């Protein structure tokens, strides 16, 4: 009877349905959870409206009170459980926003990693859902920077690393090869000499499986830029567009050291990657030397 | 019958819902197809009776639903309206079926129409001659039989229902009041008849009592309806109920006279009536010109006269007005050949000149119907069923096709799935009659109908109806269908149903393949490395991946499946999705080439074996070899990069530490031996396969016998591109491996051997590349 009568006005304004739910506080299941909890979760899913129910952050500050806050207590637990059911239904962005309301950055940062890692792996096109996810993630990052909100430092550093990675790929896709270059050496993941390979090894075990996957694309763009540099220098002789031959030769020698170190590390990584990636690594590096 | 029990019971099990009509609609079609199974396509009439019977059972089903609806719910008012449209389509079935069975009988009997004779015997000879001779009146008679069969079906048991309408006291109120006037101290100041005559009041102008006259009017509804239907047995029934045996007598003034007792003893052949009937109808004609009647008598005898103006008042329906058209024209005709057959041309009856000389045709039926300035008939005229059935009568094929055109212009929302099916049966019986309608309109209707049909899915339904199409369209639509059939159970079931009901599935799968090829394609570049900033899976990529299943399901499609799979392997690699290539290789069996070879052998025929199957064998093998050498090089590269351990180099330590160093050195011995053995085996195998793909077919690659630009110029372009792409680095990697293995003597002979223009392998290296190989030979 109750649930059918709720059906009579499910899409009505929120708090109205809330007093209906309020009667269901006394009711629950001895086989698990409460009908109250399940219904509030499902209906707020249908709602996608929160600033009145749980309240809202002014921008990111204190949570302004919600409607249920007046008649109910300890609403952060409801926040967490509801966003848990949301992500169980795959409602990732809204669950993340709800934990932003909850002040629980851990799952927020984890999930934004799983969100950005695929979209980061595509080209930089204006008005893209890649850009949407980028924007929400950078908003999260800026909020936590301003707030001093600190997760496990491993995840924090990896996330700042990722953000710098998007900066890199944006430069690459815009064709600002020099800017992307500067970005990568300040990212200091550039093994110019063979001695940086074991440093890259040390960096590797710091990584989770997902970024371990994405290192392949990272090094792909890397060798792309490297080969462009070497070929452009080779095409620039001393009688064409300047760039004297001695400087080009010395820089190409340094670059060849870098490329051979890159291939050595690519071979001596500890977990298996794509054989296509391996072959392409080797064949652009032969083009390099 | 079980059909009625099923109707009521499923009405109970179905009323919970709110759209039972379409559920029953789909429920109809399996019966359609089963019936097509049990009976042939020359038995279309029995098909029509089974149509009507089953759709009548469903009529009853919707009646049961609508009546089981509680008051105050028009949610099933839609159900009742659809049920109404259902009865309209039913009567359309009756109309067309009878009309064209009469058409068939006419076509059978065309060569003996019309007669001539002179009066020699009883006038029933005149009568049955007249009935047999003409067509126009014949179909008029049949359509009248239609309408009044409708009427009597509506009637049914009005007999048992009048059990409760009955009064058998003649003018009881006038009776009792004149009795009390004669009976009491005080009479009444009220005028009444002294006579019981059916014309006692109006002849005497004297009043009658309201209850008297109004139970009269009530029985007038009863019998008026009964005879507008002509329900004559019930007519004499009601007469002999209420004691109007006078009126029952009045009923007989028109039915003619006969007798045939020219045989045997004095026995009844016919005694029926008074032969004064021609003049008696003339008398009724003039009584009509006299007017002053009740509605009922006015209508009945203006009917018995076919008097148009005094028949105007009572008939206002579309059915009533067309009915009256037929009645009037049938009468005028029938009396015309009465006077024609019975020899006379002098005065024996009087009628107005225009009535005598009015001509009659089936065109006039609908011209009158249209020209009716009565808005009831006018609005009924625009109703679809009416237009449909009057086109049925008229055979106006151009008007029908244009009208269907405006229907489809409005779309399919006005033409529900059952409407589309009904127009479909329309066209079906057209064809089984060898009558052909306009084909683009037909295919438009059918495609919209099949759109419906697929909205209601049910693989068992689709194939026969699709079998009615232009070939390209039928192929495309069964493709759209079966590509959703993705679970092997109903998949194979759909294949058996398709092979049973037409449109083989194999050509369907191929057509899916080339349509997929037509939408999307992969990269092509014989220059080093595929251009991209970031790369990943595409919708086109997945579509090309997943079009394959349709071919791979059928074991018989293996040849073309392999051909297109190798082509898409080419697209994989040239679009830099070798991972897609390897996944598809894992998907496809490794013995497919041998299976195809064995199958072409098993037919005991190998002469018609073209270059093509054996080519497909070569592509499959060449992709296998190139990919395998690829992961072999990668495996050797990863293995060499994984040393067992470095030698222990710690200095002075403890005795237990010395034992630990000895254990470390022994472990180093085993690991180094195993790792080096594997490394050298991998090195040897890698160079072996390098030569195999570098010294294959005169050092060729992807090479094939048929590179015809008549078959595919793009195939040749792709293949030369593949060689120009893959050859350079393959040679350079061989140079690097041999140099690392200190095989510089092999580098010098291998670097000097890279010109095979026999199988397109001598013009794949470039100026900068040949410079690079010059420096490689220089390092060696």
Phi-psi region of B757 (alpha: psi -120 to 50; beta: other; left: phi over 0): alpha
Q: Do B631 and A275 touch (CB under 8 A)?
A: yes
Triad B520, B524, B525: Cα angle to 5°: 160
Neighbours of B427 (CB within 10 A): 19
CA distance B404 to B115: 41
- Asked if the C-beta of B579 comes within 8 angstroms of chain A's C-beta atoms, the answer is yes
Contact yes or no for B212/B174 (Cβ under 8 A): yes
Contact B360, B333 (CB under 8 A): yes
- Determine how many CB atoms are found less than 10 A away from the CB of residue B231: 20
Map tokens 């008549």 to a residue: B710
Name which of A250, A235, A279, A244 is nearest A192 in CA terms.
A250
**Beta-carbon contacts of residue B417 (< 8 Å; ≥ 6 apart):** B22, B25, B449, B452, B453, B455, B456
Are B147 and B330 within 8 A, CB to CB?
Answer: no
CA-based angle B237:B238:B239, to the nearest 5?
Answer: 95
CA–CA–CA angle B12, B14, B16 (5° rounding)? 90
Experimental method: cryo-EM
A268 to chain B: nearest residue by CA? B641
Residue B756 bridge partners (DSSP): B761
Give residue B677's Cα distance to chain centre: 71
Of residues B727, B734, B730, the one with CA closest to residue B762: B727
Chain B nearest-CA distance from A16, in A, is 29
Residues of A with CB under 8 A from a CB of B: 121-124, 169, 172-173, 217, 221, 224, 227, 264, 267-268, 272, 274-276, 278-280, 282-284, 286-287
Contact criterion met (CB < 8 Å) for B641 and A268: yes
Cα–Cα distance measured from residue B466 to residue B450, given in angstroms and rounded to the nearest whole number: 8
Please state, in angstroms and as integers, the Cα–Cα distance from residue B394 to each residue in A255, B38, B140, B425, following that order: 91, 33, 13, 18
Q: Which helix (H) or strand (E) holds B400?
A: helix B397-410
Residues B372, B381: Cα–Cα separation, whole Å? 10
Take residue B356 and report the two structure tokens written for it.
Answer: 């005598």
A13: left (phi over 0), alpha (psi -120 to 50) or beta: beta
The number of C-beta contacts closer than 8 angstroms across A and B is 60
Cβ neighbours around B345 below 10 Å, total: 7
CA A198 to chain centre: 27
Interchain contact B534–A (C-beta under 8 A): yes
Nearest to B534 among A122, A274, A287 (CB): A122
Judged by CB atoms closer than 8 Å, whether chains meet at B529 and A279 is answered as no
Helices (H), chain A: 2-7, 14-22, 35-47, 67-71, 75-88, 92-102, 105-120, 129-147, 153-174, 177-186, 197-205, 209-235, 245-268, 275-288
Say yes or no for a CB contact (<8 Å) between B528 and A287. yes
Token code pair at residue B196: 């019981």
Closest-CA distance of chain B to residue A232, Å: 14
Query: A191 and A198 in contact (C-beta within 8 Å)?
Result: no
Task: Give A-chain residues touching B578 at CB under 8 angstroms.
Answer: 275-276
Counting every residue written for chain A, the total comes to 289
Helices (H) then strands (E): counts for chain B: 37, 0
Provide the 3-class DSSP secondary structure of residue B640. Answer: helix
- The whole-angstrom separation of Cα A193 and Cα A190 is 9
Residue B756: strand, helix, or coil: strand
Where do we find the tokens 């009792």? Answer: B176
CA-to-CA distance for B368 and B380, rounded, in angstroms?
Answer: 14
CA atoms within 13 A of residue B292's CA, in its CB half-sphere: 7
d(CA B98, CA B610): 60
Using a CB-CB cut-off of 8 Å, the residues of chain A touching B641 are 264, 267-268
Q: Using DSSP, state whether B138 is helix, strand or coil.
A: helix
Residue B349's region, left for phi above 0, alpha for psi from -120 to 50, else beta, is beta
- CA A148 to CA A130: how far, in whole Å? 26
The residue assigned the tokens 């029985």 is: B219
Distance CA B325, CA B369 (A): 8
Q: Dihedral sign for Cα B435, B441, B446, B452, please.
A: negative
Residues of B numbered 717-756 whose beta carbons fall under 8 angstroms of chain A's beta carbons: which are they? 729, 732-733, 736
Q: Where are the alpha helices (DSSP H) in B641-752?
A: 655-694, 713-740, 744-751
DSSP state of B646: P
Interchain CB distance below 8 Å, B736 and A286: yes
DSSP B514: H
Contacts of A275 in chain B (CB under 8 A): 578, 630-631, 634-635
Cα torsion angle, B595, B601, B604, B606, sign? positive
CB distance A274–B579 less than 8 Å? Answer: yes
Place of tokens 């009158």: B368
Q: How open is the CA angle B202-B207-B213, to the nearest 5 degrees?
A: 90
Structure tokens at B183: 């009976």
Backbone angles phi, psi at A63, to 5 degrees: -80, 115
> What is the Cα–Cα distance from A273 to B772, expressed in whole angstroms?
29
Q: Give CA torsion, residues B197, B200, B201, B204, to 10 deg.
A: -170
Query: Which structure tokens are listed for B164?
Result: 């409760």
B612 Cβ contact list (under 8 Å, min separation 6): B559, B563, B706
């Amino acid at each position: 009877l109750l649930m059918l009568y709720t059906r009579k006005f499910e899409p009505t304004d929120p708090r109205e349905a809330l007093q209906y739910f309020y009667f269901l506080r006394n009711e629950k299941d001895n086989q698990g959870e409460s009908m109250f909890l399940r219904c509030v979760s499902e209906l707020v899913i249908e709602s996608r409206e929160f600033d009145m129910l749980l309240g809202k952050l002014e921008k990111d500050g204190s949570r302004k009170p919600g409607a249920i806050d007046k008649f109910t207590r300890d609403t952060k637990t409801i926040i967490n459980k509801v966003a848990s059911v949301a992500e169980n239904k795959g409602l990732f962005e809204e669950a993340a926003k709800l934990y932003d309301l909850a002040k629980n950055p851990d799952k927020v940062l984890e999930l934004t990693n799983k969100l950005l890692s695929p979209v980061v792996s595509q080209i930089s096109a204006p008005q893209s859902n890649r850009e949407r996810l980028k924007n929400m993630a950078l908003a999260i990052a800026e909020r936590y920077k301003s707030q001093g909100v600190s997760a496990e430092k491993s995840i924090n550093s990896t996330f700042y690393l990722l953000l710098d990675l998007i900066t890199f790929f944006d430069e690459y896709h815009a064709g600002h090869i020099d800017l992307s270059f500067d970005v990568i050496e300040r990212l200091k993941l550039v093994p110019l000499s063979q001695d940086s390979v074991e440093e890259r090894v040390a960096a590797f075990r710091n990584f989770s499986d997902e970024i371990r996957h994405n290192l392949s694309e990272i090094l792909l763009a890397t060798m792309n830029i490297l080969f462009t540099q070497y070929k452009r220098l080779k095409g620039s002789g001393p009688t064409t567009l300047g760039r004297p031959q001695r400087v080009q030769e010395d820089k190409d020698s340094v670059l060849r050291s870098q490329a051979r170190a890159l291939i050595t590390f690519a071979g001596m990584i500890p977990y298996r990657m794509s054989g296509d990636t391996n072959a392409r690594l080797v064949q652009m590096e032969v083009l390099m030397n | 019958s079980p059909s009625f029990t099923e109707d009521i019971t499923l009405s109970a099990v179905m009323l919970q819902e709110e759209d039972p009509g379409e559920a029953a609609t789909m429920s109809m079609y399996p019966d359609f197809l089963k019936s097509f199974l049990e009976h042939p396509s020359s038995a279309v009439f029995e098909l029509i009776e089974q149509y009507e019977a089953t759709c009548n059972t469903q009529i009853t089903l919707l009646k049961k639903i609508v009546k089981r609806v509680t008051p105050g719910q028009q949610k099933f008012s839609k159900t009742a309206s659809i049920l109404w449209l259902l009865q309209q389509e039913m009567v359309t079935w009756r109309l067309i079926a009878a009309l064209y069975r009469d058409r068939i009988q006419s076509a059978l009997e065309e060569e003996n129409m019309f007669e001539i004779a002179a009066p020699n015997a009883s006038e029933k000879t005149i009568v049955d001659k007249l009935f047999q001779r003409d067509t126009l009146v014949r179909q008029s008679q049949l359509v009248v039989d239609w309408l009044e069969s409708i009427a009597k079906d509506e009637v049914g048991d009005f007999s048992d229902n009048i059990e409760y309408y009955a009064k058998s006291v003649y003018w009881e109120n006038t009776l009792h009041t004149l009795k009390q006037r004669s009976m009491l101290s005080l009479g009444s100041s009220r005028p009444l008849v002294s006579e019981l005559d059916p014309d006692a009041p109006i002849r005497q102008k004297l009043p009658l009592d309201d209850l008297d006259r109004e139970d009269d009017i009530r029985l007038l509804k009863y019998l008026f309806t009964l005879i507008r239907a002509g329900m004559t047995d019930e007519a004499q029934r009601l007469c002999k109920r209420c004691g109007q045996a006078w009126r029952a007598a009045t009923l007989e003034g028109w039915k003619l006279y006969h007798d045939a007792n020219i045989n045997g003893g004095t026995e009844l052949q016919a005694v029926e009536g008074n032969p004064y009937r021609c003049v008696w109808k003339t008398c009724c004609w003039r009584m009509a010109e006299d007017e002053q009647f009740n509605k009922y008598e006015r209508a009945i005898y203006a009917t018995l006269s076919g008097n148009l103006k005094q028949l105007l008042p009572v008939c206002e329906s579309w059915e009533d007005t067309v009915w009256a058209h037929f009645k009037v024209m049938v009468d005028s005709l029938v009396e015309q050949e009465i006077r024609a057959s019975i020899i006379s041309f002098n005065e024996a009856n009087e009628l107005p000149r225009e009535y005598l000389e009015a001509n009659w045709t089936l065109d006039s039926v609908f011209e009158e119907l249209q020209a009716t300035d009565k808005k009831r008939v006018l609005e009924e005229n625009r109703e679809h069923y009416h237009i449909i059935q009057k086109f049925v009568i008229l055979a106006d094929v151009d008007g029908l096709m244009d009208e269907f055109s405006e229907w489809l212009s409005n779309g399919k929302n006005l033409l529900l799935g059952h409407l589309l099916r009904f127009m479909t049966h329309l066209l079906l019986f057209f064809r089984t009659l060898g009558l052909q309608a306009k084909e683009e309109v037909s295919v438009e209707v059918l495609k919209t109908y099949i759109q419906r049909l697929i909205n209601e899915k049910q693989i068992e339904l689709i194939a026969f109806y699709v079998s009615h199409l232009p070939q390209e369209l039928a192929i495309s639509q069964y493709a759209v269908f079966l590509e959703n059939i993705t679970d092997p159970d109903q998949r194979q079931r759909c294949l058996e149903l398709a092979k049973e009901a037409g449109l083989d599935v194999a050509s369907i799968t191929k057509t899916v393949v080339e349509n997929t090829r037509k939408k999307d394609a992969g990269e092509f570049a014989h220059h080093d490395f595929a251009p991209a900033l970031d790369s990943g899976t595409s919708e086109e990529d997945r579509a090309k991946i997943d079009v394959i299943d349709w071919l791979v399901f059928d074991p018989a499609q293996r040849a073309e499946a392999l051909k297109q799979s190798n082509a898409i392997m080419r697209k994989f690699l040239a679009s830099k999705k070798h991972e897609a290539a390897k996944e598809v290789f894992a998907k496809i069996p490794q013995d497919s080439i041998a299976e195809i070879y064995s199958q072409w052998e098993e037919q005991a025929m190998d002469s018609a074996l073209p270059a093509e199957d054996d080519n497909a064998i070569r592509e499959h093998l060449c992709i296998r070899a190139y990919l395998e050498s690829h992961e072999a090089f990668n495996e050797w590269f990863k293995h060499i990069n994984s040393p067992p351990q470095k030698p222990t180099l710690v200095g002075q330590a403890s005795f237990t530490e010395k034992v630990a160093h000895e254990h470390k050195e022994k472990k180093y011995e085993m690991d180094f031996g195993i790792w080096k053995g594997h490394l050298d085996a991998l090195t040897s195998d890698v160079k072996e396969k390098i030569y195999n793909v570098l010294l294959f077919v005169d050092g060729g690659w992807m090479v094939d016998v048929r590179e015809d630009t008549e078959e595919d110029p793009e195939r040749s372009h792709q293949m030369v591109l593949l060689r120009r792409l893959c050859l350079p680095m393959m040679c350079f990697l061989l140079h690097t491996v041999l140099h690392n293995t200190k095989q510089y003597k092999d580098c010098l002979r291998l670097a000097d051997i890279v010109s095979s223009e026999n199988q397109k392998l001598y013009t794949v290296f470039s100026k900068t590349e040949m410079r690079n190989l010059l420096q490689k030979l220089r390092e060696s």
